RNA sequence: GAGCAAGAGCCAUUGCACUCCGGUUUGAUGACCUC
């Protein structure tokens, strides 16, 4: 984990996930997300902070940085699992299309660019 | 045991999803005359069974006679007439 | 000449392919394992199919039993597929 | 292992409907499926 993220910023990003499933396209789970990034389809990825073992998502920051993809941390992976609409935990996700919620996502990106 | 426009079928394969079940039933049974509807549920009380609503009783009879014990999804159909008229049939009669 | 695969024609052409595959399965699973089911995609070749079982006996029982069965209200013509005509069909888009 | 990306087991029920009603374990830390 590279930087700290305030709670409200997360909660916002999760709301934005659940919403963006309605108009955009989401890739859920770490293998799909890594693939999405490698193919440069990733608009922004989500990483959970309670992944055990950490080696599962540990390569996402480096890989996003190499492909110029913004990325945000969220506390719980059960939360992330709920946010993407599945019946199990989720460790990492990625928005690869949004349409409706462009400016919202946009605004979140610079907030992440803070640190 | 008294002839009805509707045949009641059971001993069906409970693993088959509902829409598929309706369409497969309609294949094997549209054979016998016009079908007004096919009714399927997978609730506790209604699983494994189906109702096929023929427009004509003759159709019903030939279906029942011709398909009795037929291995549908590898599992022998038990067919018998429905105990009472399906609502659409009653409406047609017209009682209801 | 007996095969583990039967060829069917006089199928009903106003039936979409997924439903067709499933219904075919519904009526043929009773004779044994089915490796695959292919329906025609061309227009030549408009109402045709291959059902590929695993065992030749399966295909033989199926052929005897279902000859002329009025599937979607049209009695099937069923025969043994010629050797490799199914994989050759799948390799092209004839299907 | 590669590909795919959300279902897959078990227990119970043989049950006559036309608005709808069992339980349980597992699966994005990757199920059925393809090679
Ligand atoms: O959608 P899939 O996982 O059944 O291929």
Author numbering:
A (entry chain C): 3 to 117
B (entry chain A): 6 to 101
C (entry chain B): 7 to 101
Q: What's written in the study?
A:
The kink turn (k-turn) is a structural motif found in most functional RNA species, including the ribosome (1), spliceosome (2), several riboswitches and box C/D (8) and H/ACA (9) small nucleolar ribonucleoprotein species. k-turns introduce a tight kink into the axis of double-stranded RNA sections, with an included angle of ∼50°, and frequently mediate tertiary interactions in larger RNA molecules, exemplified by the SAM-I riboswitch. In addition, most k-turns are binding sites for specific proteins. L7Ae is a member of a widespread structurally conserved family of proteins that bind k-turns, important in the assembly of the ribosome, the box C/D and H/ACA nucleoproteins and the spliceosome. Kt-23 RNA of T. solenopsae is an unusual k-turn in that an adenine is in place of the normal guanine at the 2n position, thus creating a potential A•A pair at the 2b•2n position.
The RNA used in crystallization experiments comprised an 11-bp duplex in the center of which was the T. solenopsae Kt-23 sequence. The duplex section terminated with a 10-nt loop that is the binding site for the U1A protein. The RNA was co-crystallized with a mixture of Archeoglobus fulgidus L7Ae and human U1A proteins. There are two complexes present in the asymmetric unit, each of which contains one fully base-paired RNA duplex bound by L7Ae in the center and a dimer of U1A of which one monomer is bound at the terminal loop. As in the other complexes, L7Ae binds in the continuous major groove that forms the outer face of the Kt-23 k-turn. Two main regions of the protein interact with the RNA. These are the hydrophobic loop comprising residues 86–93 that envelops the L2 and L1 nucleobases, capping the NC and C helices, respectively, and a basic α-helix comprising residues 27–41. Despite the presence of the rare A•A pair at the 2b•2n position, the T. solenopsae Kt-23 structure adopts conventional k-turn conformation in most respects and superimposes with that of Kt-7 (22) with a root-mean-square deviation = 0.63 Å. The bond from −1n O2′ is accepted by A2b N3 (O–N = 2.7 Å), and thus the structure falls into the N3 class of k-turn structures. In common with N3 k-turn structures with a standard A2b•G2n base pair, the rotational setting of the A2b nucleobase allows a single hydrogen bond to form, from A2b N6 to A2n N3 (N–N = 3 Å). The structure of Kt-23 in the complex contrasts with that found when inserted into the SAM-I riboswitch, where it is an N1 structure lacking a hydrogen bond between A2b and A2n.
